[PDB]
């Protein structure tokens, strides 16, 4: 529909009606100009008196000045409403857009979304501002012209109005012929270029067999076919421009001859004929203009509907739960959970998993690197609904507490921790506002990132310039872990990548203080088994099915798929 | 450097001179005829008689008919020259491109070259086909018309030459102000949008912290800061259109009033003024046209100097090798060769390794499994020169052999085999002239491919449609090695990829029965270590340095990195 587009201009109707009013005034001025112009000319040819004084001044003053001023203020306020429309529409789209489930982001590509945002906002703002504007302008203009044609000479207007459609018909016929042939030429050239691209793509395989000059040969054959196609459309353009020229010639000279007959036979004055042919040329101009812009308008309105499908798409789950205790004990428990991805409901990435989390201890879990390993991390952040089971915190599920309080109480670090084009003091508390300097530097010293913080060109409050391309792996690792710790959450989750460029320093730091002294159930998903030797409670599952639990010496008491992996990886 | 563009227009001089001639006569007709139109109106004011219409028609018939005739001829000829020049440039550039060394495609991109083979070639054809055309047309037209108006009335000529620079100056300075303002608006818009882009591009983390409302806040804050400036921009546009309209108004009415006074002064007939105003009219049209074209012309000549960056570019590898015996035995050897890439000479991948290959036997090799040992296959296929040592073939260096003959003798398979959008028998009998079809049948037997091809839509004459995306990679490797076997290669290159998810009996038959029972000296690389059983001469390396040789039975003794990797497989 377009009723949404109707509704999204309601606080702008004052500017709209003032714009349309001034538009109609400029229209009446522009169409009133030529008849008085011709009266002045019929003075300057027939009655060479000082009525030309009067006619010339009335030609200039009200007509030209009013038309110019009206057009100017019209375009000005149209640019105003263009700005206001773009602002409000872009703001509302972005405000709606971020409030959706993650599955929406998994389904749709990202660059498509931002291209949709920017390009289509500009497209629909151009649609309201420019195309509709000049369309209405030219239509009221041409209606005024044909009004003057039926007022001046019904004879002459009937002649030109049986004339003009013949021109339009033959021009459309031969132009469609021409454009179709040129499109065929474009298609064949595209075909040959696609062949050449497919050759040059994996071309080392071709160099394995030395076929290259034959690829040149077949390319040349395709191009020769293109050539023989092209001669015909050359002849077509020839014929088209021939016909158009001869037709406009014969109709124009018939106009002039019959008008001369009418004026010398004493039917209308000469200035009437003058104004008449003036109006014919301006009519042709306006008709060509509207015929040009109609297709661009159609493209715009076709582009418009891509926005509204996401303007008000209903999200599935809302953060309706609201609870914020002053503190907690940090008791987390799993309960026979059977999550699956919503995007592909065939599989079973989780099946009936239950385990508690000890307040204070360090719970550990490593998968077989093929099954569900990086999924509980998505469970614990309410990023999805769950199929079976229900995960509670302190007896209450995630749908009980406040969402912002939930993010306040539990942090998260990824394996590829992205940052923002901001300063460090910005990026250290990306979420939490109202932070003091001293807590940040204290946590950074606890983060052991403080070294490569201070040695920089601006040290503490430097900025992640060139889109943050001035750090490395272990750097942003320490940065993100600081970004975790600055909130001081009662519960932390840590799972890092396979590289782990920290030379055992950060692990010494956590198992010095942040694994024992910091009373937080810090669940660890680990790769490279560098921490399975040192933990508090270790489990391992495949797709939902646990094979081993307990402390790692029970894992040593039964090394089934525990010891086999660690003996494999040295 | 532009004489290069001359250096390819050379075989087209006849079409060029004909086109220029017809362009010239068209322009001359166009610049003549309105003066005689003014002569006709001079008759309509005074000699309204039989001499009127005679003169009128004998002017307009010859003039307009010759104009449209020559214009049609000119358009057709420039169409033909566009086609011919585009064909010649595309063929020559694509031909010279493929003969470049492999390191070029290694360093250079792919889609950039496709752009360079389609779009800018189209652009450089558009240069000589359109921009030169309309530029020359309009400049000779403006010279002709300024000659006529200078010939008629030097007084009003001086009026026009005092007027038009004022219009052009004020329009240029105000449009510069305007365009600077609008570009400021657009840049601020992009600067505001990229923040939301950064949010939405990695929104998992901010959703993990729930600050999207603050993002919307700072977003609309930026956008308000934008539209405050946009107000000033629009006001400036209003002042621009005001000034342009007012100035053109006042200069035009001054021209008309002075012309009326000079007509009543009697020295100037009416038709003189008629010619003056009409010719002034086209002048403005022509000035509009040249101001439109000049920028796109500069764009085209800028795009033009990218195809000559490579169309005359020297190859870096000679291909003077000519040895081609009737048959060969195939003791390919090495001589302590070392190698690094030409991108970075410090990064070494090969250091001083030599080993022979006994003809007619199966010989495999796996290095440290970390080095890109496929570099050995690359130095087999003569894709690069070598720094140290030398590689030969049966006593003769691999260079001196004929290039096509070399690639005929030794075959190759990749890891991910690629194919074209041709029929499979064409994809099989690819780099070789029309060898009969029963050999393809024999290969499909030997590849064990004869079965599954019968379960296609046609069988043999079928084509791998949908841009080649309908077969699994197992049969892809199957048909790839089938492509090798139709060549009847004496020496063979084989390297199965990491998956090897096929029926796997074809692999042991490859080790034993497929090629191993014939004169097929085959070199094998493998990830799946099921091949290490069936072997004769296992060589193992590290960082391009040989450590062991002989059978794997000797490697049972020297299990260092061998037996370490045997159990690493399990």
């Amino acid at each position: 529909t377009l009723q949404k587009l109707l509704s999204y201009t309601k606080p702008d109707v004052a500017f709209l009606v003032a714009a349309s009013f001034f538009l109609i005034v400029a229209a009446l001025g522009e169409t009133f100009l030529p008849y008085y112009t011709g009266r002045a000319i019929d003075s300057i040819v027939i009655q060479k008196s000082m009525d030309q004084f009067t006619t010339a001044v009335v030609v200039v003053c009200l007509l030209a000045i009013g038309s110019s001023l009206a057009a100017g203020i019209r375009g000005g306020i149209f640019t105003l409403v263009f700005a206001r429309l773009n602002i409000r529409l872009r703001n509302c789209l972005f405000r709606s857009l971020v409030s959706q489930e993650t599955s929406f982001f998994d389904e749709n590509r990202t660059g498509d979304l931002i291209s949709r945002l920017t390009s289509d906002t500009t497209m629909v703002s151009d649609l309201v501002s420019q195309n509709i504007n000049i369309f209405l302008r030219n239509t009221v203009k041409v209606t005024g012209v044909v009004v003057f044609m039926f007022s001046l000479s019904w004879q002459l207007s009937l002649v030109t109005f049986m004339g003009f459609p013949i021109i339009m018909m033959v021009s459309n016929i031969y132009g469609k012929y021409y454009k179709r042939l040129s499109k065929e030429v474009q298609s064949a050239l595209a075909r040959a270029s696609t062949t050449a691209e497919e050759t040059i793509s994996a071309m080392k395989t071709v160099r394995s067999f030395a076929n290259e000059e034959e690829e040149a040969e077949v390319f040349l054959r395709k191009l020769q076919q293109v050539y023989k196609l092209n001669r015909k459309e050359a002849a077509a353009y020839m014929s088209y421009v021939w016909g158009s020229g001869l037709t406009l010639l014969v109709v124009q000279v018939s106009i002039l001859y019959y008008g001369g007959h009418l004026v010398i036979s004493g039917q209308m004055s000469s200035g009437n004929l003058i104004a008449f042919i003036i109006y014919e040329f301006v009519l042709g101009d306006c008709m060509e203009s509207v015929g040009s812009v109609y297709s661009g308008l159609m493209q715009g309105v076709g582009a418009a509907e891509k926005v509204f499908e996401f303007i008000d798409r209903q999200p599935t789950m809302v953060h309706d739960g609201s609870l914020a205790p002053d503190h907690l004990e940090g008791r987390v428990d799993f309960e026979n959970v059977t999550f699956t991805y919503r995007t592909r409901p065939h599989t079973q990435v989780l099946q009936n998993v239950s385990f508690s989390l000890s307040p204070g201890k360090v719970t550990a879990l490593v998968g077989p690197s093929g099954s569900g390993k990086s999924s509980c991390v998505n469970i614990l952040e309410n990023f999805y609904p769950l199929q079976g089971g229900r995960v509670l915190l302190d007896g209450k599920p995630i749908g009980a507490y406040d969402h912002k309080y939930l993010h306040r109480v539990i942090s998260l670090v990824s394996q590829e921790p992205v940052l923002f084009a901001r300063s460090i003091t910005d990026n250290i508390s990306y979420g939490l506002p109202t932070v003091p300097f001293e807590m940040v530097v204290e946590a950074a010293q606890k983060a052991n990132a403080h070294g490569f913080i201070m040695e920089l060109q601006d040290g503490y409050s430097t900025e992640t310039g060139e889109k943050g391309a001035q750090l490395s792996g272990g750097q942003k690792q320490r940065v993100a872990m600081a970004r975790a710790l600055v909130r001081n959450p009662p519960v932390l989750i840590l799972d890092e990548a396979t590289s782990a460029l920290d030379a055992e320093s950060e692990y010494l730091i956590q198992q010095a203080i942040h694994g024992n002294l910091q009373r937080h159930t810090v669940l660890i998903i680990a790769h490279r088994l560098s921490t399975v030797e040192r933990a508090h409670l270790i489990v391992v599952l495949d797709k939902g099915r646990v094979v081993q639990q307990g402390t790692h010496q029970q894992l040593l008491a039964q090394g089934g798929l525990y010891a086999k992996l660690v003996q494999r990886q040295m | 450097t532009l004489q290069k563009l001359l250096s390819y227009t050379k075989p087209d001089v006849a079409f060029l001179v004909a086109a220029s001639f017809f362009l010239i006569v068209a322009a001359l007709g166009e610049t003549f005829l309105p003066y005689y139109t003014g002569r006709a109106i001079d008759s309509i004011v005074i000699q309204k008689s039989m001499d009127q219409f005679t003169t009128a028609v004998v002017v307009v018939c010859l003039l307009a008919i010759g104009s449209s005739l020559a214009a049609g001829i000119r358009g057709g000829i420039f169409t033909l020259v566009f086609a011919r020049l585009n064909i010649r440039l595309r063929n020559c550039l694509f031909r010279s491109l493929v003969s470049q060394e492999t390191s070029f495609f290694d360093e250079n991109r792919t889609g950039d070259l496709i752009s360079r083979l389609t779009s800018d070639t189209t652009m450089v054809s558009d240069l000589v086909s359109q921009n030169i055309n309309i530029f020359l047309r309009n400049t000779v037209k403006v010279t002709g018309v300024v000659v006529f108006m200078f010939s008629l009335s030097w007084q009003l000529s001086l009026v026009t030459f005092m007027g038009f620079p004022i219009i052009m100056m004020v329009s240029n300075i105000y449009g510069k102000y305007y365009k600077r303002l609008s570009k400021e608006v657009q840049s601020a818009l992009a600067r505001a949008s990229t923040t939301a882009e950064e949010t939405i591009s990695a929104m998992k983390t901010v959703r993990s912290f729930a600050n999207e409302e603050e993002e919307a806040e700072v977003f609309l804050r930026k956008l308000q800061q934008v539209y405050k400036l946009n107000r000033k921009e629009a006001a400036a546009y209003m002042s621009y259109v005001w000034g342009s309209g007012l100035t053109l108004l006042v200069v035009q009415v001054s021209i008309l009033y002075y012309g009326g006074h000079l007509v009543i002064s009697g020295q100037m007939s009416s038709g003189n003024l008629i010619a003056f105003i009409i010719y002034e009219f086209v002048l403005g049209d022509c000035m509009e046209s040249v101001g439109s074209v000049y920028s796109g012309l500069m764009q085209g000549v800028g795009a033009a100097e990218k195809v000559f960056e490579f169309i005359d570019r020297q190859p870096t590898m000679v291909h003077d090798g000519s040895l081609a015996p009737d048959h060969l035995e195939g003791r390919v050897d090495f001589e302590n060769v070392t190698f690094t890439y030409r991108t970075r000479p410090h990064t070494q991948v090969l250091q001083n390794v030599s080993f022979s290959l006994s003809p007619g036997k199966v010989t495999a090799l796996v290095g440290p499994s970390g080095s890109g040992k496929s570099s050995c296959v690359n130095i087999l296929e003569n894709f690069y020169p070598l720094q140290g040592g030398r590689v030969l073939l049966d006593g003769k260096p691999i260079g001196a052999y004929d290039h096509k003959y070399l690639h005929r003798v030794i075959s190759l398979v990749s890891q991910e085999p690629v194919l074209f959008a041709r029929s499979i028998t064409d994809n099989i009998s690819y780099g070789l002239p029309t060898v009969p079809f029963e050999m393809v049948v024999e290969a499909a037997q030997k590849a064990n491919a004869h079965g599954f091809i019968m379960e296609l839509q046609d069988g043999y004459s079928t084509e791998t449609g949908e841009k080649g995306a309908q077969l699994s990679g197992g049969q892809k490797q199957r048909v790839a090695m089938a492509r090798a076997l139709v060549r009847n290669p004496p020496v063979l290159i084989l390297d199965e990829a990491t998956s090897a998810l096929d029926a796997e009996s074809e692999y042991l038959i490859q080790q034993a029965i497929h090629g191993n029972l014939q004169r097929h000296t085959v070199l094998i690389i493998a990830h799946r270590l099921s091949t290490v059983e069936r072997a004769h001469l296992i060589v193992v390396l590290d960082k391009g340095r040989v450590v062991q040789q002989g059978t794997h039975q000797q490697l049972l003794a020297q299990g260092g990195l061998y037996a370490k990797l045997v159990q690493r497989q399990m």
Binding site: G75, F78, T79, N133, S292, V293 | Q130, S292
Partner: peptide, 9 residues
């Protein structure tokens, strides 16, 4: 022959 018109309001 031009392709598309200029930008104006």
């Amino acid at each position: 022959r031009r392709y598309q018109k200029s930008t104006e309001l």
